[PDB]
Amino acid sequence: MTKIALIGSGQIGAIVGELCLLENLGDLILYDVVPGIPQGKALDLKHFSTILGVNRNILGTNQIEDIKDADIIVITAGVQRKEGMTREDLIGVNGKIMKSVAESVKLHCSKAFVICVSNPLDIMVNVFHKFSNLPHEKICGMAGILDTSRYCSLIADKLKVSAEDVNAVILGGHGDLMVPLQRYTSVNGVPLSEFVKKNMISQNEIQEIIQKTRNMGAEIIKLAKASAAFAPAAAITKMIKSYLYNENNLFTCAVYLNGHYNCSNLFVGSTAKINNKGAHPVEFPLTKEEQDLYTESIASVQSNTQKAFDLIK
Amino acid sequence: MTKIALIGSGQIGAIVGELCLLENLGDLILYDVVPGIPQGKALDLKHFSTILGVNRNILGTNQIEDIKDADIIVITAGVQRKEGMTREDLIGVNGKIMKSVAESVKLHCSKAFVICVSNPLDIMVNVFHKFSNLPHEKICGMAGILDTSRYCSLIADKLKVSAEDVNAVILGGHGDLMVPLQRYTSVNGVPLSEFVKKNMISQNEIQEIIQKTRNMGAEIIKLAKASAAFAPAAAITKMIKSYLYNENNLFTCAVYLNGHYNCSNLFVGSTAKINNKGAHPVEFPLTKEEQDLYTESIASVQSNTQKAFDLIK
Amino acid sequence: MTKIALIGSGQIGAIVGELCLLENLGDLILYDVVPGIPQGKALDLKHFSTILGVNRNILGTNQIEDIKDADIIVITAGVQRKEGMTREDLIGVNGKIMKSVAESVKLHCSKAFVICVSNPLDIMVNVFHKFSNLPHEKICGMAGILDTSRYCSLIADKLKVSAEDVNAVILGGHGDLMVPLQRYTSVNGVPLSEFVKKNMISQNEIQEIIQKTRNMGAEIIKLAKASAAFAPAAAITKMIKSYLYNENNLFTCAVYLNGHYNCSNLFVGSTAKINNKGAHPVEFPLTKEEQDLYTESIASVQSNTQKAFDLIK
Amino acid sequence: MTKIALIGSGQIGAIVGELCLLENLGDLILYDVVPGIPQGKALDLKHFSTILGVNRNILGTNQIEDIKDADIIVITAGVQRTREDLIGVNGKIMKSVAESVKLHCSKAFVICVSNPLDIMVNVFHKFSNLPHEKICGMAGILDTSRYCSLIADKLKVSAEDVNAVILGGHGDLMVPLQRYTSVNGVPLSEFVKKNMISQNEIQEIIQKTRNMGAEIIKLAKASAAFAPAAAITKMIKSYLYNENNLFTCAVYLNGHYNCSNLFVGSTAKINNKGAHPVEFPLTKEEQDLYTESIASVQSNTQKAFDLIK
Amino acid sequence: MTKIALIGSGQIGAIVGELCLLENLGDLILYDVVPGIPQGKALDLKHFSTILGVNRNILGTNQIEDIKDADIIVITAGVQRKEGMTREDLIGVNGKIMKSVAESVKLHCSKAFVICVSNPLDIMVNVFHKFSNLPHEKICGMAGILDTSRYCSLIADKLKVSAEDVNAVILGGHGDLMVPLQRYTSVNGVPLSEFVKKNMISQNEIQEIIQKTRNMGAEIIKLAKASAAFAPAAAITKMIKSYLYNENNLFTCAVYLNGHYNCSNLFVGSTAKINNKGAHPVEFPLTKEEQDLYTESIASVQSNTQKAFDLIK
């Protein structure tokens, strides 16, 4: 009975649709502006479903009114960046697209939970909130689960441990101003600081890893000639799951801050829980230095958001 | 310990890599000729693995010698057809690529099981056997599972039943001369003929379905502007699973015929079992009319396979 | 949000609860009459859930009113048979228990889909219908999927093939009068009759297999000193999945016949589809000899159902 | 091709077999001393495998020589449950199983589960003649799942990414480490500062973790079976897929945590080559508690060897 | 080619034969035990046929073997009640006659559809089923259509409307325990309850009408000194037409209940469809009070049916 609407049928959207089918999360509605594309991917997904013994319904469509009564909305519509570009270079063209999608969600399914993925991520979440007229808890963006996966992955490789239970908090905008928190990094519970004391990893090695984490999105673009699609989709699917199954998992994602971390009235990457009712920020006690870094990331997001609202007229 | 080598890091390869990681089938070796592309898709797949709690090793490489000691080899290297083209139009350019891959497999990992996917499928399997010097049971091509999934999917939709236990045999080349067998179609055990007698489906509706099955590959190209990727990858994975886990499953795939179905010395789509030791054809009793249709399909594959050998000089 | 209520917290109920947690099918309500048993198994299941990263809610209870608003009800309450006993020997004691459970479902959650499992299976489904006041499509019993799995498993072994795509129809009561249909047995689409023509299996070997399928329930009791628990639970879970996910799968189960197969006003093992709306019988064209065997099975179920109603006063 | 041998076909063994089938880990060999039991559970399990589309091979047997060439061995043989009788009755059984593994499949990776856990792992090592990295016992994972589950409930969070380290014997002398408890990376101490949980609530949780195994016996009238089996599976997975995951399990210490020549619950990585201990920097107070748990295990292990004559 | 056999050539049988001729329903076989009577009525009916241009064959006979290969059988054999008698007073004499007719139908034309009319109706249908060995859907009794005509006729008179499209359901035995359903009474689609709201008829007037409907059979006997013949024949002919022409019309008639309306293993007046395959009960949702009344009627039929079986030894 659950309806999952993918607004954008590109790489990310299709794989999200594929992952949703694998766990039987819901019926799919594959929407795109370009005719034929969602219908074709829907056909390929049905044949996939038939081989793997999944039976959920899959509808490829160019009529955005088919998004009606979606329980979940994943928004990937928009352009992606190429080599040499920053995420922020998409601000002009994607803001306009995000506004249009916001206006459509507003009239067709105002009760949905909305996961935004168009870049630049934090900014585009703010745009969606402005024109959608949905409650702020019902809107979020994925990024932090992606950036955390890259940072944990690298930490795991340097410590010669499984990535499976390397956990971390990354605060701030999905960009060059991310703030990975060493204090809030653990390896199956054990703080990262223990592994520095045991000489298994050095402060310099960690700064190196933080740098690779920041650039990773660009590095994949450079190597693969396309932007990361599998990891983003997995992250998204994890956030859909936490909503549908009322799991109340504690992630980083772009969420409405409201007095938390000295910030108010802005969607930005932060610690949050996701459950039945949406995405709910949680404030943890930062050090002065940590908070100072975070606030600096928050300032860019503020600026670039305003820039976006301006460029939309 | 199992090594799975994906020769070709395009759409199909990457998704196959994805599905192998989801079931922990083995460590991945992502190979492509184009520099950077495998390394980037490996990075994205690592991050995907970290988020889903899979821990297998993933290596993106341009050095084909990294394929050494692969247990499994999936070949997608080659060009894909565009709108208006037939699969057979690729014969010239893909034959040459398949030969080169054959030669590399020959010197680097002669003990592997080899699933060919490059088009036109049956033809390219015959090229790979010629220049690879591997036993014929250790080589096959995936197609029948994809064509079957399409046909069964359509049968299921018309009968208002789950596709989950709709099974069927499609013989012949992956092309316009497929031979779907009504007699060998069942719905959780019940032959298709019972549903015609019960007036739940008509002989004309079935012929319509057979036509859509034949043209499906082209239809997806037309709609999606790219060829099918998810369903092919799922089919491939199913054949990998049947080899690794010695399952002895009965599929249709491009296999070496040797006195079966009045055919010898040719890889062509047929009923086969896959296990530990490779792909083994099985002959079932066809009617005169069925065999005639099958022989006709076999003839095209014969011709076009000769053409492919000729055009390689 | 989905609530799955297990009326009976023995072996079968707990394993069904386990499988439902593995696929995230819903929140569990474990009910039993015996104090402390459901609470303890619930604790074990929560810890199991923690290890495997499942997060659904699990409540062990002795208050049957906790069953309120269950979407799904699985009934295993009742006594199981020992060595030397038939399923029919339980008629007296389990009929009374089934009536009590029927009455409780009637007042506490009349909108649920109800899978009966207490023996003798077909008879107890009829008892539940009588005292529950639920629509007949919302009530069924699992047996045919179990018997079919046994018969298909044995056929697969003899043919040296994967059981994975061996499908079959078994009609009739869950007992010595089952009617496995050779005509409706296939191996990945290929009818069983093709394998007899190819001399891979004989008519005698098939009769032997039918006999083992009939006695299997008793043979496991003899060997294991307890009745089968894992396969029953898997079957049950497969029917739950078909209902929750609106799959419309075609099984055999105990279902309300209404002019189908010359039978009316009786729950008995038959071919049926399960979807959103419940269990719906489907009639396939039987031969005279097949229908005669089926009618004979139906007659026992008739007699024994009457016996059960009589013994309830 | 992988062969998984379940020495003991009771509740735990069967469910382990069930979980192995669900992930296609390997062919099963179900062994028990009682005739008929394994054959019957094997039949059920084949039917279960048919319904769920798994195809691995399952053999029920009473001939221990069928254990030959097992890549993995899970030992649940023994009685569940005067303590000098437990340690008394199961020590003898464990020795007999050790001897059999010695002659029939010396290359196997061995997970011991018979109680009292730690003690019995040490008995297995003494009479099996297998390398010490190839032997371990599951217990930590189970105690950690209980503790993390309770923490998660109190904090109103998913248990999914609550991780923790619990050191020491599987018993009243467990040492849960608050410092090594996190919630998707965030240390438990941040939640006490935020007043989402109190030090007393934690001590309460530690106590319930210690008594859990008894509480389930009391309530269910049988010992826990589903969680133990999941734990065991998780270790099997880490070995077969060379995952190198960091668990707490009973493992051979050798200069780690001031302890040498003993199997005891400790932080370890499991891969292709077996279980390998890893030492983390404990505080004095933490190490003191851990040493105390290690002393019991020492004493009782001696007791066990003594009672075996 | 259709053969219609009238077992009993009294008033009803002859008139049924007349109506069947008028609509060309089939060739007639007029059977009676009394010599000469069927031959003489057959002569009169031939001459009737000649005048009205009907050309079906008509055979008057005392040899019951002439009933062979009848497609339809109408049983009016038996004694009719006089003034002061109930229908139940015939139980002794007619039960024995019905059994004898049952035995004859059994050996001479087991494939026929059988409409029983001898009184007391419901009881005598049950006797025929017991000794005939015919499927229960191939046996029914006419009564409800008669009682309905009477009730509808009286409703029409009081509302000053055509009886033509006044329809109703009357459940239960053909006797003093009939249950006419006000809820299931309509005037060309408009429920009876609309006419009470409009003050065109009162609840008391309706109860009066129900009473006259119950006693109508006796009132005609008192006035005409013979029992009703024209209406019974018309009703019978309507049930013949529905069978021959596969009309699937929804009547009330004595039909085999099998879990419908909390009743099993008894022929009693109920809602049913008549088609090619026979008479098939249909259960509609009754109120508690309606069902209670119906059950009470079913109880008498039960008792008297037992009485009938007893008196037959």
PDB file of C-alpha atoms in Angstrom, chain E residues 79-81 86-95 98 116-127 142-143 173-175 254 267 300-301 304-305 308:
ATOM      1  CA  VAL E  79     -51.708 -36.207  -2.810  1.00  0.00           C
ATOM      2  CA  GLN E  80     -52.876 -32.644  -2.239  1.00  0.00           C
ATOM      3  CA  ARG E  81     -54.281 -31.299   1.007  1.00  0.00           C
ATOM      4  CA  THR E  86     -51.882 -28.531   6.862  1.00  0.00           C
ATOM      5  CA  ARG E  87     -49.265 -29.317   4.147  1.00  0.00           C
ATOM      6  CA  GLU E  88     -47.418 -31.287   6.893  1.00  0.00           C
ATOM      7  CA  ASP E  89     -50.389 -33.776   7.216  1.00  0.00           C
ATOM      8  CA  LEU E  90     -49.316 -35.239   3.804  1.00  0.00           C
ATOM      9  CA  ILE E  91     -45.868 -36.142   5.132  1.00  0.00           C
ATOM     10  CA  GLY E  92     -46.650 -39.878   5.520  1.00  0.00           C
ATOM     11  CA  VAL E  93     -48.305 -40.586   2.163  1.00  0.00           C
ATOM     12  CA  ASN E  94     -46.159 -38.276  -0.039  1.00  0.00           C
ATOM     13  CA  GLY E  95     -42.744 -39.177   1.414  1.00  0.00           C
ATOM     14  CA  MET E  98     -41.413 -39.168  -3.491  1.00  0.00           C
ATOM     15  CA  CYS E 116     -39.981 -30.902  -6.954  1.00  0.00           C
ATOM     16  CA  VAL E 117     -43.472 -29.621  -6.234  1.00  0.00           C
ATOM     17  CA  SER E 118     -45.269 -32.228  -3.992  1.00  0.00           C
ATOM     18  CA  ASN E 119     -46.124 -31.018  -0.481  1.00  0.00           C
ATOM     19  CA  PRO E 120     -44.961 -30.324   2.063  1.00  0.00           C
ATOM     20  CA  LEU E 121     -42.519 -28.846  -0.400  1.00  0.00           C
ATOM     21  CA  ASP E 122     -39.209 -28.352   1.432  1.00  0.00           C
ATOM     22  CA  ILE E 123     -39.511 -31.672   3.178  1.00  0.00           C
ATOM     23  CA  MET E 124     -40.218 -33.606  -0.046  1.00  0.00           C
ATOM     24  CA  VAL E 125     -37.166 -32.026  -1.780  1.00  0.00           C
ATOM     25  CA  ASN E 126     -35.001 -33.448   1.042  1.00  0.00           C
ATOM     26  CA  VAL E 127     -36.645 -36.916   0.534  1.00  0.00           C
ATOM     27  CA  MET E 142     -40.548 -24.365  -6.316  1.00  0.00           C
ATOM     28  CA  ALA E 143     -42.214 -22.353  -3.570  1.00  0.00           C
ATOM     29  CA  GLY E 173     -40.083 -23.086   4.335  1.00  0.00           C
ATOM     30  CA  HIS E 174     -43.198 -23.044   2.259  1.00  0.00           C
ATOM     31  CA  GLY E 175     -45.489 -22.750   5.248  1.00  0.00           C
ATOM     32  CA  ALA E 254     -35.934 -24.746  -2.007  1.00  0.00           C
ATOM     33  CA  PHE E 267     -32.886 -28.194   1.288  1.00  0.00           C
ATOM     34  CA  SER E 300     -39.224 -26.804  11.483  1.00  0.00           C
ATOM     35  CA  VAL E 301     -37.997 -27.966   8.126  1.00  0.00           C
ATOM     36  CA  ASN E 304     -40.275 -32.426   9.752  1.00  0.00           C
ATOM     37  CA  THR E 305     -37.600 -33.758   7.381  1.00  0.00           C
ATOM     38  CA  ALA E 308     -40.385 -37.847   7.071  1.00  0.00           C
TER      39      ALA E 308
END
